[PDB]
RNA sequence: GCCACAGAG
DNA sequence: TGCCTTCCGAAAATTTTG
DNA sequence: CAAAATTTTCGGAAGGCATGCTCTGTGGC
């Protein structure tokens, strides 16, 4: 939250984000804006691409493609806001390893 | 009865197992993920046999554990169609007889469809009756070595239901899953049974 | 045995695919069909009414209600969508320019493209080069549409295709109409369509002569019902030259017309906070969705038993305006409704929106803001954190075989003496335990080797230090912390030049990283010793400042001569 | 570098950058989002602003390479062990 | 106030219920029973479908073990399927690049013939 | 996980038993190890064995099921006594006859007895051999290489 | 609603996943997947979705096919006349073959048993002992294999009498024009053919002309038009029984060329059947037999259902549209085979028309009686027959097909929405444009039912709502609304609706046969087929009879849907 | 495979500052989860200072995998890089 | 939680 | 208070028909 | 040549963004 009257924190604005990019700090930016700010565990079905819940995709009626991932909660909020606007932010997933 | 399966997988070596031998660590996590578990449409894996090819261990940005792509060979309990096998009779019921191979693959279910003709279950001593003629009289008793041929193998995947259905089941049970891997055997020739029947 | 092998492969996002949702996708993902304008039933305990714009099936807003779709509290439900069916289709306030473009690009009598096959083949070959980008693709679409307009007559029928445009081009209720002027290109030839039009008007003017004055403005309007039925008949092979890929089932023009409005989860429209009232309030989205449900109920009930067409079209226009202002509340004013709101488009743009308020930059934990005081006796890589600030700021240190005794002592010292610990978390546990509601002696002896303890910010820990106007890259730097008890952040004055800091009530910020990787990142790349040169021109920017250069001048003056005692005193003073 | 003086504005960033999310973070967010949903344009997440939005490691700076740990085993030790039953077998009596 | 202007033909009770039926309730005049000539027509359709599905132009849907047993002796697959190249082909009708998979050199043999006077319905 | 090929080779039961006994001995899982190290004396070296209950249980059950007497007389399997060169000699003597590869596989998995066990394990015994070859191979398999 | 349904119930029970696909795509894909396999279905699906495609583009788009599978699928589709191709050369000289989709093969797959039934009816051979089975089997073999040569089909039979009957029956089938010689014409698109002919006739004109560009264009267009009319009708006239007397003074179909089903003549027959069904409504029952004989005498020489010149993209010029209409009226009036008198129709009435007391003028197949029947046909409201000269008659296909369209559409909308729908549709089709009050005065029925029925008609595009504003800025709050009938939008909408219903029926049938594959496969093979009683269990009998009964109902309803969908192609 | 042969390499052998930062970060994260240290420690407990003391005398068992733009990758041992 | 001013660098 | 794009009649300029 | 089509060029209106970056307070709905 905002303000010292609600035990709030400090803003890390767009200019500070650009300044951290200017050093080549990737891990620090990931820590600041995802790990310790709004981390959230989500389940994504990598055949359609929409969010589910509790290891279940509510479109395909199956748990055959559910994958646990970590995103900011603001990302999930944006995706649901877009979905209510009849925009579908379908996610596509690749392997993190070349395998 | 035992076959070799070439299985490729992504194995996770934690940082706190660097001090051990590398092959030992791969073996340990492979036994963690694979041993005494069934690989679907493959069979049941007991342990791993040898590692064939390993690659350089990559690292995920955020955690220090090393991930390695290993293509290993694993022993699998996958008998073919026609391999005679011996088990120990453990249970019976009006739908068939349950036999287990003394601690390994407890689920073998001999039905009455391919079993010997003329058999009938008596619900008074919990036994089947197999008369060869008027003179012979014997019962399908328990705790003896029985020989049979695996006639059918059943491959069914288990799916978690919708969490509403799972919650309903949890609320109902507080006030028997299908077996994922099963071999169905049969006896249709001379000597297909207990040794004492065929001295 | 009977346990099935569990396979897990870590994944990343490869790329987003932006599309629209067909009717099947909007209904299939839904859980409840919102068909009642009542939010709370007054008869029983102010509960959320079933089949309503607020409903347990779409989530919860308090901490004492369950979802009954996933059975979680407010912190454990990601949201569950609803769906709403409209009595008559309405247009989309966002894709309206897209709808105008596509009806420009098709015939209005048989729903086919206006190009001949030769130009169509040439343009299709033009789109599918391997090197196409966004600019070239939109340019080719612009040229295709400009070729569509130039056509006189369709090629599968002899119909006339005129000019498609808006009605008033303003902020009124007319802003969501489409006019298809069909005889501005009719010319002076025979034109049988003109004959049909004049015969129709020769028939209708016999009983309403007063309408003869308005024959010039009566143009063939395209309501969403006829627009939708013109969309359904468009050949799927024609979607490519209108920008829509026709491979996926959602890639159809019919998708861009509102037939199913997805009711957003209550997690993205929670109950607005109340100060002293015994009741509660609801966000503008909930109220306006209830407004939509009521208007659609009115339209369907009016279609069941006949009403004059003027009233039905008026309420249908009100539904269109209410949908449009639900999605976007800048193009249309609330003045036209019978009788601004925080819509979706006003939550995605602006300084305090989402894309610039909570995604591209967001408030972080583990920060602290304090006024600034000088301290020259501190090394130029060391900032001074007060005693009462380092007792709340903490670093999560994981116990290893090298720091067991140190962390045991930190845990015993407690959360009230500075070299102490404030939280402990174990491997077998999922919730951290406070170190003040405990014994602080049993936890030392039973410390697992894989535990994590949030120790106090002691000497040597890496802190990010920042000043709010971040004009260039030197504004955020990394310092080693030193603990000194005077309630103010203190940094060496040679470091204050990049911060543009003046000890005049100035306020600077202190973040603390959590993972060791980010700590090493900050200390090795962001460090003040490693960054003494601005990349503006390579000049040194962390050097002597005012009153340090004066001391240098006074020492190095020609008329200075120090004896041996003063020399050795200065030499021992500077080190 | 696109071939014409595009400039630094919304109308230049539209003509330079193919990405959707990065243009969405700048100006006219809803218009770009709706146009991207209409034309159905793929958005490969490689841009830095997209990476920060979706919460994953960017590919500039300290994300340009993957640090790799080498397994210290040779190819001679990973020779497969004997398959005695298959090795001693032959097919000459009947096949 | 908003919900206060109802038209001439409605009251306060009709509104407040937004349940548009998703199931249909309006049938066509084609829905009736089956007559004798229509039965023969349906037999003709189903016979043609069953003929073509096994015919030389089907394409795939996109024990069974290789072990050496002795049940395979004097045992043979109950039918020999027809491939893509086992039919007469007019060389002029087909395009040029399609000559690879089809067999110009291979002999053109198959010409089936089948029709039944007895219905293939078990009812 | 991605399965590359299902059945790379076949395993005799002797190979499985030998590999599992080697694994048991290397990790000191045998009853002799617990009798000598764990039981009958106090522990001073603190050399704990391998700690994984599931693999230990499955290996113990498999070795117990393989090593014991099989359905041919109501002592041991016979496999737990015969060695590598014994297997070579036995299965080379098997190679002289017309039985196929998988047939040799069940011949080396279990061991057929005189009474109709060869009839069950071999397909169509009468269509294959006369009496003398059957009785001599029964003698050589009952002789344990 | 006794119990509310969740969206899961809507997705499972109600067909909602199927409402988001185009009727054309859904119909073609379900038909191809029903008859051929899934690979042909996917190839046709991408061909319809993305339009013209090449083999490399097909490999890139469809996932899971190599080039060999794609080429096998394309050969299978090309044999069944289901994909058209065109070889195009570029400037560099790299020739590439583009593939399309053609309607004819799909419609053949959708018209199979109806084609068999119609050719059985049009055989008209007296005292057939084995000939009917032979015609049925030769037609089925022709349709299933796409195209076949007569010689290759003759080699499958060795007996002499049956081979002679093959020769006679193929001669008979080709005589009326049901089996026509195929060529590269049926596999190239009409648009590409017209473009090539026009460009060759335009580039061939001598250069440096001091003559006008527009009229040079029209002159090249007219020469291309007459060559187009020569080339399209080439197989239609006669191309397969031109040979006379190979041996022993007999007429045999050419034993050198392959025959293929002629779909457009079958469309002529179905339009004739639709006209007969319309004539069975206003006048007569024996008079219907008379008009049926009149159509069946002139069924072969009838004009096309759609003019191939109309699909050539030459409708932008209004003068060419009027010229097409006038040429249609030209050909339909004075074709040298469509004109007949009473005596020509005398020799075709079978022995069931009585006509002794068929008419009463007061308030043996003779010329006067058949003339009276032709006259009462000529006096009907719809132009069933027209007289270029008193005594000779011609059927006006140019001015009767719109009438048949209107009548069929009005009866459909009446049977599905009620007689109020008929009343309002006819009231707003007679009057060109009305407000509400003109309806309320002229159509004598209550106000609210007018508003309800007319509101229900807008949803299916029977009436278009025309706004007339009374304000400086347009608004429906104060405006007057008129109601019109646009025939084209309505006809197209109901055509696509019927296509969707047909495809929904076939999808449900395919799902039923796929879900119950075990029993159908057990009963499928020949040793049990016809003697299913001995081995099957009591429940299996009920299951098999349920499956077969549902299949028969599905295909019967498909035929009944075709009987309404064929009209809207014309 | 896709990797350039080790005999010839067309990238700069001087270790970039970002490579040093990532090596120290990964080593500190690995030591923070009970990994062995090959360098003798004089008593230092915090993982990151031990990581610096480890790299100061080149006993880090990692290898840096450099991505060229096309997709081919080269391998560089931390022993081989010079500082 | 929404608006309005007041300020600090 | 400045700046820029897109859209659309309106009138001037061109090719195009008779 | 002058009547008409057809394409181009020049305005007024409507939209958008800027109006920094954050931080702390009251006062009242
Ligand atoms: Mg100041
Ligand atoms: Zn899914
Ligand atoms: Zn929930
Ligand atoms: Zn048109």
Report domain extents, chain B.
2-77, 83-197
Contact across the interface for H33 and B14, Cβ inside 8 Å: yes
Residue C417's closest CA among C451, C449, C396, C440?
C440
In eight-state DSSP terms, residue D80 is P
Residue C238's closest CA among C160, C145, C151?
C145
**Is there a contact between C366 and C511 (Cβ–Cβ < 8 Å)?**
yes
Task: Work out the burial of residue F39: count CB atoms within 10 Å of its CB; fewer than 13 is exposed, 13-18 middle, 19 or more buried.
Answer: exposed
**Is there a contact between C542 and C494 (Cβ–Cβ < 8 Å)?**
yes
DSSP G49-107: HH-SEEHHHHHHHSTT--HHHHHHHHHHHHHTT---EEEEE-TT--EEEEE---HHHHH
Question: Distance from first CA to last CA of chain B, Å, rounded?
Answer: 26
- Strand K close to C362 by CB, under 7 A: no
3-class secondary structure for G458-484? HCCCCCEEEEEECCCCCCCCCEEEEEE
Residue B9's closest CA among B54, B63, B65?
B54
Q: How far out from the chain centre does Cα G417 lie?
A: 26
State how far the alpha carbon of G188 is from the alpha carbons of C386, C562, G97, G116, G196, in Å: 86, 108, 11, 27, 11
CA–CA separation, C315 and C337 (whole Å): 10
Residue A63: in which H helix or E strand, if any?
Answer: none
Enumerate neighbours of C (3 or more CB pairs within 8 A).
A, B, D, E, F, G, H
Distance (Å) from CA C107 to ligand 2 centroid: 37
Contact across the interface for C1 and B179, Cβ inside 8 Å: no
E49 phi and psi angles, rounded to 5 deg: -65, -45
State how far the alpha carbon of C355 is from the alpha carbons of C17, C360, D26, in Å: 18, 6, 8
**Is there a contact between D73 and B20 (Cβ–Cβ < 8 Å)?**
no
Q: Which of residues 21-80 of A touch C (CB under 8 A)?
A: 22-28, 30-33, 35-38, 42, 46, 49-51, 53-54, 58-59, 67, 69, 72, 74-78, 80
**Is there a contact between D52 and A29 (Cβ–Cβ < 8 Å)?**
yes
| Length of chain B counted residue by residue | 199
Among all bound ligands, the one having the nearest atom to the CA of A66 is: 2
**Is there a contact between G300 and G266 (Cβ–Cβ < 8 Å)?**
no
Among all bound ligands, the one having the nearest atom to the CA of C469 is: 1
Instruction: For residue B57, give the nearest of D57, D71, D81 by CB distance.
Output: D71
- Strand order in G85-89's β-sheet? G53-54, G95-99, G85-89
The answer for residues whose C-beta is within 8 angstroms of residue C524's C-beta and 6 or more apart is C530, H17, H20, H21, H24, H25
The token pair at C141 is: 């679409």
CA–CA separation, H44 and G559 (whole Å): 88
**Is there a contact between D24 and D49 (Cβ–Cβ < 8 Å)?**
no
CA–CA separation, A46 and G123 (whole Å): 59
The per-type count for chain G, helices as H runs and strands as E runs, is 25, 10
Instruction: For residue C18, give the nearest of D17, D25, D37 by CB distance.
Output: D37
Q: Which residues pair with A62 in a beta bridge?
A: A57
A19 is in an annotated binding site: no
DSSP C350-380: STTSSIIIIISS--BSSEEEEEEEE-TTS-T
Q: How far out from the chain centre does Cα G369 lie?
A: 35
Residues of E in contact with C307 (CB under 8 A): 7-10
SS3 state at F35: helix
Task: Work out the burial of residue G500: count CB atoms within 10 Å of its CB; fewer than 13 is exposed, 13-18 middle, 19 or more buried.
Answer: buried
- Strand I close to C502 by CB, under 7 A: yes
Q: How far out from the chain centre does Cα G69 lie?
A: 32
CA–CA separation, D10 and C135 (whole Å): 14
Of residues 141 to 180 in chain C, which lie within 7 A of strand J by their beta carbon? Answer: 163-166, 169
Q: Which residues pair with H3 in a beta bridge?
A: H73
Say which CATH class B83-197 falls into: mainly beta
CA–CA separation, C506 and C490 (whole Å): 12
Q: A82 — contact with chain D (CB < 8 Å)?
A: yes
In eight-state DSSP terms, residue F72 is T
CA–CA separation, C332 and B9 (whole Å): 57
Give the nearest nucleotide to C189, CA to C1'.
K4
Name the protein residue, with chain letter, whose CA is nearest the C1' of K20.
C469
Break chain G down into helix, strand, coil percent, rounded to 5.
60, 10, 35
**Is there a contact between G460 and G438 (Cβ–Cβ < 8 Å)?**
no
3-class secondary structure for chain H? CCECCCCCCCCCCECCHHHHHHHHHHHHHHHCCCCCCCCCCCCCCCHHHHHHHHHCCCCCCEEEEEECCCCCEEEEECCCCEC
CA–CA separation, G97 and E95 (whole Å): 8
Of residues 249 to 288 in chain C, which lie within 7 A of strand I by their beta carbon? Answer: 272-273, 275
Distance (Å) from CA C55 to ligand 3 centroid: 10
- C166 CA: distance to closest CA in chain D (Å): 18
State how far the alpha carbon of E67 is from the alpha carbons of B80, D87, E64, G293, in Å: 9, 17, 9, 70
The token pair at C312 is: 């039905």
The token pair at G175 is: 């005589």
In eight-state DSSP terms, residue C501 is -
CB atoms within 10 A of CB C495: 24
A57 is in an annotated binding site: yes
CB atoms within 10 A of CB A83: 23
Distance (Å) from CA C474 to ligand 1 centroid: 19
DSSP E strand stretches across G313-412: 386-389, 392-394
CA–CA separation, F64 and B88 (whole Å): 13
Instruction: For residue D68, give the nearest of H19, H25, H63 by CB distance.
Output: H63
Residues of F in contact with C7 (CB under 8 A): 1
Supply the angle between the helices G419-430 and G447-458 in degrees, to the nearest 10: 80
Report how this structure was experimentally obtained: cryo-EM
Residues of C in contact with G56 (CB under 8 A): none
The answer for residues whose C-beta is within 8 angstroms of residue C365's C-beta and 6 or more apart is A9, A36, A37
Q: Best of B8, B56, B65, B160 to disrupt the A interface by mutation (most A CBs within 10 Å)?
A: B160
CA–CA separation, G339 and G389 (whole Å): 10
Contact across the interface for D69 and H63, Cβ inside 8 Å: yes
Contact across the interface for H25 and C449, Cβ inside 8 Å: no
SS3 state at G394: strand
Give the nearest nucleotide to C356, CA to C1'.
K21
Give, in Å, how far the C1' of K25 lies from the CA of C502.
23
Name the protein residue, with chain letter, whose CA is nearest the C1' of K29.
C275
Q: B41 — contact with chain E (CB < 8 Å)?
A: no
Q: According to DSSP H, which parts of A1-99 are helical?
A: 14-21, 27-30, 73-84
CA–CA separation, C140 and C121 (whole Å): 13
Among all bound ligands, the one having the nearest atom to the CA of A58 is: 2
Residue E55's closest CA among E91, E86, E76?
E86
Q: C515 — contact with chain B (CB < 8 Å)?
A: yes
Give the nearest nucleotide to C146, CA to C1'.
K7
DSSP G201-238: HHHTS-SS--S-HHHHHHHHHHHHHHHHHHHHTHHHH-
The answer for residues whose C-beta is within 8 angstroms of residue D44's C-beta and 6 or more apart is C14, C15, D19
Angle at A33 between CA A32 and CA A35, to 5 degrees: 70
Residue G45's closest CA among G31, G29, G22, G59?
G29
G122 phi and psi angles, rounded to 5 deg: -90, 0
C157 is in an annotated binding site: no
- Strand order in G147-149's β-sheet? G147-149, G258-261, G179-181
Q: According to DSSP H, which parts of B13-101 are helical?
A: 22-34
Give, in Å, how far the C1' of K5 lies from the CA of C142.
24
**Is there a contact between G10 and C85 (Cβ–Cβ < 8 Å)?**
no
CA–CA separation, C176 and C325 (whole Å): 11
**Is there a contact between C469 and C475 (Cβ–Cβ < 8 Å)?**
yes
The token pair at D54 is: 């979706």
Residue with tokens 């099947």: C24
**Is there a contact between G144 and E51 (Cβ–Cβ < 8 Å)?**
yes
Name the protein residue, with chain letter, whose CA is nearest the C1' of K21.
C469
CA–CA separation, C386 and C463 (whole Å): 13
Distance (Å) from CA C505 to ligand 1 centroid: 7
**Is there a contact between A71 and D55 (Cβ–Cβ < 8 Å)?**
yes
**Is there a contact between C247 and G49 (Cβ–Cβ < 8 Å)?**
yes
The token pair at G351 is: 């022995």
The token pair at C449 is: 């080797």
Residue A31's closest CA among A67, A68, A72, A1?
A72
CA–CA separation, D91 and G514 (whole Å): 44
H22 phi and psi angles, rounded to 5 deg: -70, -35
The answer for residues whose C-beta is within 8 angstroms of residue A48's C-beta and 6 or more apart is A57, A59, A60, A90
CA–CA separation, C524 and H18 (whole Å): 9
CA–CA separation, A65 and G375 (whole Å): 74
Residue with tokens 């009124």: C172
- Strand J close to C125 by CB, under 7 A: no
Distance (Å) from CA C502 to ligand 1 centroid: 5
Residues of D in contact with C134 (CB under 8 A): 14, 17-18, 41
Residue C143's closest CA among C164, C169, C124, C167?
C124
- Strand K close to C361 by CB, under 7 A: yes
Distance (Å) from CA C71 to ligand 3 centroid: 6
| Length of chain C counted residue by residue | 575
Q: C392 — contact with chain A (CB < 8 Å)?
A: no
**Is there a contact between G101 and E25 (Cβ–Cβ < 8 Å)?**
no
CA–CA separation, G265 and G305 (whole Å): 9
Residue E81's closest CA among E115, E50, E116, E53?
E53
C254 phi and psi angles, rounded to 5 deg: -60, -25
**Is there a contact between C76 and C251 (Cβ–Cβ < 8 Å)?**
no
Q: F9 — contact with chain C (CB < 8 Å)?
A: no
Contact across the interface for D91 and F9, Cβ inside 8 Å: no
CA–CA separation, C404 and E36 (whole Å): 92
Q: E74 — contact with chain F (CB < 8 Å)?
A: no
Break chain B down into helix, strand, coil percent, rounded to 5.
15, 45, 40
Distance (Å) from CA A90 to ligand 3 centroid: 21
CA–CA separation, C446 and B181 (whole Å): 43
Contact across the interface for D90 and F15, Cβ inside 8 Å: no
Distance (Å) from CA B188 to ligand 2 centroid: 48
In eight-state DSSP terms, residue B42 is T
The token pair at G212 is: 């006008």
Q: Best of H6, H29, H31, H59 to disrupt the B interface by mutation (most B CBs within 10 Å)?
A: H29
Q: How far out from the chain centre does Cα G453 lie?
A: 32
Contact across the interface for D77 and B23, Cβ inside 8 Å: yes
Q: According to DSSP H, which parts of G384-536 are helical?
A: 401-417, 419-430, 436-442, 447-458, 487-515, 517-524
SS3 state at A7: coil
Say which CATH class B2-77 falls into: alpha beta
Residue G570's closest CA among G223, G310, G206, G182?
G310
The token pair at G355 is: 């006509």
Give the nearest nucleotide to C169, CA to C1'.
K14
């Amino acid at each position: 939250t905002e303000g010292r009257s609600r035990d709030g924190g400090l803003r890390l604005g767009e200019m500070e984000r650009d300044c951290v990019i200017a050093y080549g700090a990737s891990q620090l930016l990931l820590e600041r804006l995802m790990i310790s700010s709004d981390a959230f565990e989500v389940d994504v079905c990598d055949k359609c691409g929409l969010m589910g819940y509790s290891g279940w995709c509510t479109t395909c009626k199956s748990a055959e493609n559910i994958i646990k991932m970590t995103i900011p909660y603001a990302a999930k909020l944006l995706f649901q806001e877009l979905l209510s606007m009849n925009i579908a932010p379908r996610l596509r997933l690749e392997d993190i390893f070349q395998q | 009865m035992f076959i070799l399966s070439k299985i490729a997988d992504l194995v996770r070596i934690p940082p706190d197992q660097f001090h051990r031998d590398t092959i030992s660590a791969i073996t340990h996590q492979l036994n963690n993920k694979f041993a005494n578990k069934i690989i679907p449409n493959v069979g049941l894996c007991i342990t791993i046999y040898d590692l064939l090819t390993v690659e350089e261990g990559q690292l995920k940005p955020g955690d220090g554990s090393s991930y390695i792509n290993v293509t290993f060979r694993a022993v699998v309990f996958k008998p073919f169609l026609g391999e005679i096998v011996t088990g120990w009779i453990s249970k019976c019921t009006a739908e068939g007889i349950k036999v287990s191979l003394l601690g390994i693959f407890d689920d073998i279910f001999i039905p009455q469809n391919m079993l010997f003709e003329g058999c009938y279950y008596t619900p008074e001593e919990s036994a089947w009756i197999w008369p060869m003629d008027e003179e012979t009289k014997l019962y399908f008793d328990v705790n003896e070595k029985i020989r049979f041929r695996i006639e059918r193998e059943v491959f069914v995947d288990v799916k978690p239901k919708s969490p509403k259905e799972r919650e309903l089941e949890e609320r109902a049970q507080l006030e028997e899953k299908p077996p994922a891997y099963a071999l169905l055997g049969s006896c249709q020739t001379d000597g297909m049974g207990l040794v004492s029947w065929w001295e | 045995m009977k346990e099935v092998v569990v396979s897990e492969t870590p994944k990343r996002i490869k790329g987003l695919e932006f599309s629209a949702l067909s009717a099947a996708d909007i209904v299939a993902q839904s859980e409840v069909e919102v068909s009642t304008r009542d939010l709370f039933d007054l008869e029983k305990d102010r509960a959320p009414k079933a089949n309503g714009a607020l409903d347990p099936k779409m989530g919860v807003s308090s901490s004492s209600l369950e979802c009954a779709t996933c059975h979680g509290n407010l912190a454990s439900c990601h949201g569950h969508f609803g769906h709403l069916k409209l009595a008559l289709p309405v247009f989309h306030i966002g894709y309206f320019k897209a709808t105008i473009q596509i009806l420009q690009g098709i015939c209005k009598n048989c729903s086919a493209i206006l190009l001949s096959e030769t130009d169509k083949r040439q343009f299709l070959h033009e789109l599918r080069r391997p090197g196409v980008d966004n600019l070239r693709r939109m340019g080719i679409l612009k040229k295709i549409l400009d070729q569509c307009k130039k056509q006189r007559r369709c090629l599968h029928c002899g119909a006339l295709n005129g000019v498609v445009k808006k009605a008033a081009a303003g902020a009124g209720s007319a802003a969501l109409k489409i006019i298809h002027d069909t005889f501005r290109w009719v010319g002076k030839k025979s034109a049988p369509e003109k004959d049909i039009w004049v015969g129709e008007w020769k028939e209708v003017l016999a009983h309403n002569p007063e309408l003869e004055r308005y024959v010039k403005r009566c143009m063939d309007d395209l309501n969403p019902l006829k627009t939708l039925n013109l969309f359904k008949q468009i050949k799927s092979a024609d979607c490519e030259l209108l920008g829509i890929d026709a491979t996926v089932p959602s890639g159809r023009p019919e998708t861009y017309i509102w037939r199913y409005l997805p009711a957003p989860p209550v997690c993205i429209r929670p109950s607005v906070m109340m100060q002293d009232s015994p009741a509660s309030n609801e966000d503008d989205l909930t109220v306006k969705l209830t407004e939509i449900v009521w208007t659609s109920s009115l339209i369907k009930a009016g279609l069941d038993k006949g009403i004059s067409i003027n009233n039905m079209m008026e309420h249908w226009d009100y539904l269109q305006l209410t949908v449009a202002m639900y999605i976007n509340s800048d193009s249309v004013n609330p003045a036209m409704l019978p009788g601004p709101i925080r819509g979706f488009c006003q939550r995605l743009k602006g300084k305090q929106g989402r894309f610039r308020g909570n995604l591209s930059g967001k408030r972080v934990d583990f920060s602290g803001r304090t006024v600034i005081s000088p301290d020259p006796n501190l090394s130029i890589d060391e900032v001074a954190v007060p005693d009462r600030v380092a007792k709340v700021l903490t670093y999560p240190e994981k116990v290893t075989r090298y720091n067991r005794h140190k962390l045991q002592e930190l845990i015993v010292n407690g959360p009230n003496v500075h070299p102490g610990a404030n939280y402990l978390l174990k491997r077998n546990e999922d919730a951290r335990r406070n170190l003040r509601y405990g014994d602080r002696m049993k936890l030392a002896k039973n410390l697992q080797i894989g535990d994590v303890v949030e120790r106090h910010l002691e000497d040597g820990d890496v802190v990010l230090f920042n000043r709010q106007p971040s004009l260039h890259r030197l504004s955020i730097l990394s310092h080693y912390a030193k603990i000194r008890p005077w309630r103010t952040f203190r940094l060496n004055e040679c470091v204050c030049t990049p911060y543009n800091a003046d000890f005049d009530g100035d306020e600077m910020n202190l973040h603390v990283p959590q993972t060791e990787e980010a700590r090493a990142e900050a200390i090795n790349l962001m460090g003040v010793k490693n960054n003494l040169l601005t990349p503006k021109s390579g000049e040194p920017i962390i050097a002597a400042t005012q009153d340090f250069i004066t001391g240098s001048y006074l020492i190095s003056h020609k008329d200075s001569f120090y004896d041996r005692a003063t020399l050795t005193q200065l030499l021992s003073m500077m080190s | 570098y696109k071939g014409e003086v595009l400039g630094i504005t919304r109308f230049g960033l539209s003509k330079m950058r193919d990405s959707v999310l990065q243009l969405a973070s700048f100006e006219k967010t809803t218009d770009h989002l709706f146009d991207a949903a209409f034309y159905m344009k793929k958005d490969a997440v490689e841009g830095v602003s997209e990476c920060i939005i979706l919460g994953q490691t960017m590919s500039i700076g300290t994300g340009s390479f993957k640090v790799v740990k080498g397994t210290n085993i040779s190819e001679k030790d990973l020779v497969p062990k004997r398959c005695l039953f298959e090795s001693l077998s032959n097919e000459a009596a009947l096949k | 106030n908003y919900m206060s202007n109802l038209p001439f033909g409605l009251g306060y009770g009709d509104v407040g219920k937004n349940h548009i039926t998703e199931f249909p309730s309006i049938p066509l005049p084609i829905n009736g029973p089956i007559t004798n000539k229509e039965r023969s027509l349906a037999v003709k359709y189903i016979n043609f479908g069953k003929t073509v599905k096994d015919g030389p132009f089907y394409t795939g849907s996109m024990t069974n073990d290789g072990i050496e047993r002795y049940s395979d002796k004097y045992l043979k697959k109950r039918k020999i399927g027809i491939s893509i190249d086992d039919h007469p082909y007019n060389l002029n009708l087909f395009p040029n690049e399609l000559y690879n998979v089809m067999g110009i050199n291979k002999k053109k043999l198959l010409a089936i013939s089948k029709f039944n006077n007895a219905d293939d319905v078990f009812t | 996980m991605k399965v590359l090929e299902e059945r790379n080779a076949f395993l005799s039961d002797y190979e499985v038993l030998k590999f599992l006994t080697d694994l048991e001995k290397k990790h000191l899982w045998d009853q002799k190890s617990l009798a000598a190290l764990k039981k009958s004396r106090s522990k001073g070296k603190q050399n704990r064995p391998y700690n994984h209950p599931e693999l230990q249980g499955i290996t113990r059950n498999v070795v117990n099921y393989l090593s014991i007497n099989k359905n041919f007389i109501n002592e041991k399997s016979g496999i737990s006594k015969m060695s590598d060169e014994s297997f070579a000699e036995l299965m080379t003597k098997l190679n002289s006859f017309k039985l196929f590869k998988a047939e040799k596989l069940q011949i080396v998995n279990q061991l057929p007895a005189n009474m109709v066990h060869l009839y069950s394990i071999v397909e169509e015994c009468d269509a294959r051999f006369d009496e003398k070859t059957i009785e001599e191979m029964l003698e050589i398999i009952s002789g344990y290489a | 609603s006794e119990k509310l349904v969740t969206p899961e119930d809507v997705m499972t029970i109600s067909s909602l996943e199927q409402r988001t696909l185009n009727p054309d795509l859904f119909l073609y894909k379900e038909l191809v997947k029903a008859h051929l396999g899934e690979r042909a279905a996917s190839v046709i699906g991408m061909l319809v979705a993305l339009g013209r495609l090449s083999v490399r583009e097909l490999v890139e788009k469809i996932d899971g096919m190599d080039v060999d599978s794609v080429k096998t699928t394309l050969v299978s589709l090309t044999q069944l006349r289901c994909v058209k191709y065109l070889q195009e050369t570029a400037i560099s000289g790299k020739k590439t073959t583009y593939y399309y989709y053609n309607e004819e093969g799909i419609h053949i797959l959708l018209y199979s048993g109806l084609i068999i039934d119609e050719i059985i009816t049009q055989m008209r051979v007296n005292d057939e002992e084995e000939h009917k089975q032979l015609v049925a089997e030769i037609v089925q073999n022709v349709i299933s294999l796409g195209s076949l040569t007569v010689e290759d089909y003759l080699s499958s039979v060795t007996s002499d009498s049956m081979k002679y009957t093959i020769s006679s029956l193929f001669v008979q089938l080709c005589e009326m024009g049901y089996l026509i010689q195929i060529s590269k014409l049926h596999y190239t698109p009409i648009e590409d053919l017209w473009q090539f002919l026009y460009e060759k006739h335009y580039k061939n004109i001598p250069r440096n002309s001091p003559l006008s560009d527009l009229k040079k264009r029209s002159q090249a267009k007219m020469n291309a038009k007459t060559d187009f009319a020569k080339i399209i009708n080439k197989p239609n006239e006669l191309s397969q029984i031109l040979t006379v007397d190979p041996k022993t003074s007999l007429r045999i179909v050419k034993p050198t060329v392959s025959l293929t089903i002629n779909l457009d003549r079958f469309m002529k027959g179905r339009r004739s059947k639709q006209l007969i069904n319309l004539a069975k409504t206003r006048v007569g029952s024996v008079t219907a037999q008379v008009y049926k004989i009149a159509l069946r005498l002139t069924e072969q020489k009838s004009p096309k259902i759609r003019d191939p010149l109309t699909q050539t993209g030459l409708l932008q010029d209004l003068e060419e549209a009027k010229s097409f209409q006038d040429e249609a009226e030209l050909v339909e009036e004075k074709t040298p085979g469509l004109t007949f008198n009473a005596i020509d129709l005398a020799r075709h009435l079978p022995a069931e028309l009585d006509l002794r007391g068929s008419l009463l003028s007061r308030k043996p197949h003779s010329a006067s009686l058949i003339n009276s029947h032709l006259k009462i046909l000529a006096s009907s409201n719809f132009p069933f027959l027209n007289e270029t000269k008193p005594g000779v008659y011609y059927v006006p296909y140019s001015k009767l097909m719109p009438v048949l369209k209107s009548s069929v559409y009005e009866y459909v909308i009446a049977s599905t929405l009620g007689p109020s729908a008929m009343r309002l549709s006819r009231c707003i089709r007679d009057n060109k444009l009305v407000s509400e009050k003109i309806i309320n005065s002229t159509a004598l029925m209550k106000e609210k039912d007018i508003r309800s029925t007319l509101a229900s008609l807008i949803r299916y595009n029977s009436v278009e709502i025309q706004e007339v504003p009374r304000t400086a800025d347009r608004s429906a709050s104060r405006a007057v609304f008129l109601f019109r009938c646009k025939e084209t939008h309505s006809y197209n909408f109901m055509r696509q609706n019927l296509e969707w219903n047909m495809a929904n029926l076939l999808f449900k049938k395919e799902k039923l046969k796929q879900e119950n594959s075990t029993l159908l496969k057990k009963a499928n093979r020949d040793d049990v087929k016809g003697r299913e009683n001995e081995l099957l269990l009591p429940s299996e009998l009920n299951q098999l009879k349920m499956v077969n009964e549902r299949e028969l109902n599905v295909f019967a309803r498909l035929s009944r849907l075709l009987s309404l969908w064929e009209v809207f192609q014309m | 495979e896709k990797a350039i042969p080790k005999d010839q390499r067309a990238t700069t052998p001087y270790m970039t500052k970002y490579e040093r930062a990532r090596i120290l970060g990964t080593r500190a994260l690995q030591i923070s989860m009970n990994a062995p240290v090959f360098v003798d420690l004089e008593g230092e407990t915090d993982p990151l200072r031990i990581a610096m003391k480890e790299l100061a005398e080149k006993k880090i068992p990692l290898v840096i995998r450099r991505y060229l733009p096309d997709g081919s990758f080269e391998d560089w041992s931390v022993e081989e890089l010079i500082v």
